[PDB]
Design an enzyme around this catalytic site. Structure first.
Site, PDB file in Angstrom:
ATOM      1  N   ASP A  25       0.790  -1.241   0.000  1.00 48.50           N
ATOM      2  CA  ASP A  25       0.000   0.000   0.000  1.00 48.50           C
ATOM      3  C   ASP A  25       0.813   1.277   0.000  1.00 48.50           C
ATOM      4  OD1 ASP A  25      -1.942   1.922   0.335  1.00 48.50           O
ATOM      5  OD2 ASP A  25      -2.865   1.040   2.125  1.00 48.50           O
ATOM      6  N   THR A  26       1.011   1.869  -1.171  1.00 49.16           N
ATOM      7  CA  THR A  26       1.813   3.057  -1.291  1.00 49.16           C
ATOM      8  C   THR A  26       1.138   4.272  -0.675  1.00 49.16           C
ATOM      9  OG1 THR A  26       0.952   3.509  -3.520  1.00 49.16           O
ATOM     10  CG2 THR A  26       2.997   2.248  -3.374  1.00 49.16           C
ATOM     11  N   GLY A  27      -0.156   4.174  -0.418  1.00 47.03           N
ATOM     12  CA  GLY A  27      -0.925   5.215   0.231  1.00 47.03           C
ATOM     13  C   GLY A  27      -0.939   5.135   1.746  1.00 47.03           C
TER      14      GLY A  27
END
Ligand SMILES: [Cl-]
Ligand SMILES: [Cl-]
Ligand code: NA
EC number: 3.4.23.16
Lengths: 99, 99
Positions: A25-27
């Site tokens: 999850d880059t967020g």
């Protein structure tokens, strides 16, 4: 690997000797996992998501394997709807976004 | 480009004639933007994640430019704490996670 995003980027992780599924999850600033037992002392942390805020337990210097890649770092435990690997560990495994 | 994850992967987007900053979020199925007007029909939706669910408006066939790359797809509009580009549009710009 090179992971496309037509499906959720789910990988197997290993923590505490146990295999789990988690979302790359880059967020996410941080790594957050569903309730489990981890060793040592924990510290309080409040995190925010799309719906509001939750309280979690912060454990530092936890050994965790992500898609076969070894990491040692902070893991948050709490009432997340999914196990998420955030940027604190994505950087340890050398992950980038490319387009 | 190759985007590292030492900091939040924020990019400029153009949507609805407006420039905004948004987060490239591999952990999001859908693209969610703060309140704004968009053309066309919409229908209500509930979306969820770490602090529960929020209600949004779903607009389909919305053209967007994401860091210079044009795409089309569904855009959800509502009280998100952050503008997020999710997988439905990340795929269209060819974004991959690599490690
Ligand atoms: Cl779409
Ligand atoms: Cl592709
Ligand atoms: Na439409």
């Amino acid at each position: 690997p090179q992971i496309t995003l037509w499906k959720r980027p789910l990988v197997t992780i290993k923590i505490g000797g146990q295999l789990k599924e988690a979302l790359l999850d880059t967020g996410a600033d941080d790594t957050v996992i569903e309730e489990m037992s981890l060793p040592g002392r924990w510290k309080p942390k409040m995190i925010g998501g799309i719906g509001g805020f939750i309280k979690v337990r912060q454990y530092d210097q936890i050994i965790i394997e992500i898609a076969g890649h070894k990491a040692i770092g902070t893991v948050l435990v709490g009432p997340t709807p999914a196990n998420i690997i955030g940027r604190n560990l994505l950087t340890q495994i050398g992950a980038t976004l490319n387009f």
